[PDB]
Amino acid sequence: MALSVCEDLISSQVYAILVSHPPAPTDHLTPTPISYTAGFYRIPVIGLTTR
Amino acid sequence: SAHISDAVAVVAQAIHELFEMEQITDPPRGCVGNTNIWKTGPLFKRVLMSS
Amino acid sequence: HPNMDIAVILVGTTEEVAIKDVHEKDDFHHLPVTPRVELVTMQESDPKSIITRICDLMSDKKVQGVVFGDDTDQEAIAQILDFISVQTLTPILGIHGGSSMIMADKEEASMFFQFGPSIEQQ
Amino acid sequence: TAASTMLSEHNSIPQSKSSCNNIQESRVYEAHMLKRYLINVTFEGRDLS
């Protein structure tokens, strides 16, 4: 998920990222890393399913 | 799916409202070699929150 | 025989050099368990680079603790490291720079030490 | 000093497999109790607490 961000989600220069809960869920707050990862570059993140 | 369509709609409105703004630097190309933040981006958040 | 495995890293323009060696000389001190140290430095620190290097170092060092240090003025690096603590459950702390800066109250599960004064304390 | 308390509290080696890619060691769990010793760290008559 985060490594998918530095090369996968940042090599391409996204202006923003969307994030949603996975089909199979483990524990809670799965979309913690992205908010941090995009956050370093201040890339806006929008969650769909994270209440 | 219901949120996806809407979230992306909002993102689109936010961006189109955003580019009305000016003098924006592209985000850093790739993680490698950049220790510096991106001046552009906080602003994207500001317009996007006020969509 | 009976020594703990440890790693420390320095980043940015500043160079530790001989001082680190002196600390090791200073470090033997008095103790029953001895520290085993592997040192690596990186001219450049990145979320992908930093994330990559410490785990890569995990492969050979298999260290039970890490200290991070930087020449940098960037706040975000410490947060990434908090994520890493969450990811690997290995203690990490930092003595300078970004790792030192004040950060969000540590998630209880995460393990982490930074040399940053608390807002309340200030 | 954390290691000093590894000697005192449980006589147990703190050493653990470091790889993120590999499944986290079950005995990594124990480190949680280890954190208190970690929290209570002092040297040179000076508190790192």
Ligand SMILES: *[C@@H]1O[C@H](CO)[C@@H](O[C@@H]2O[C@H](CO)[C@@H](O)[C@H](O)[C@H]2NC(C)=O)[C@H](O)[C@H]1NC(C)=O
């Ligand atoms: C889940 O969301 C999808 C997509 O919004 C819904 O599918 C739409 O249903 C409306 C009903 O008015 C149709 O007009 C659309 O043609 C459908 N697809 C779209 C909007 O592209 C679906 O109904 C939703 N699920 C439930 C149970 O309501």
Ligand SMILES: *[C@@H]1O[C@H](CO)[C@@H](O[C@@H]2O[C@H](CO)[C@@H](O)[C@H](O)[C@H]2NC(C)=O)[C@H](O)[C@H]1NC(C)=O
């Ligand atoms: C940090 O550790 C030190 C040493 O283990 C603790 O100091 C001891 O506290 C106990 C209280 O049960 C006393 O009985 C000992 O006399 C103290 N020193 C010794 C063992 O000689 C100290 O309390 C710890 N700090 C904490 C837990 O806040």
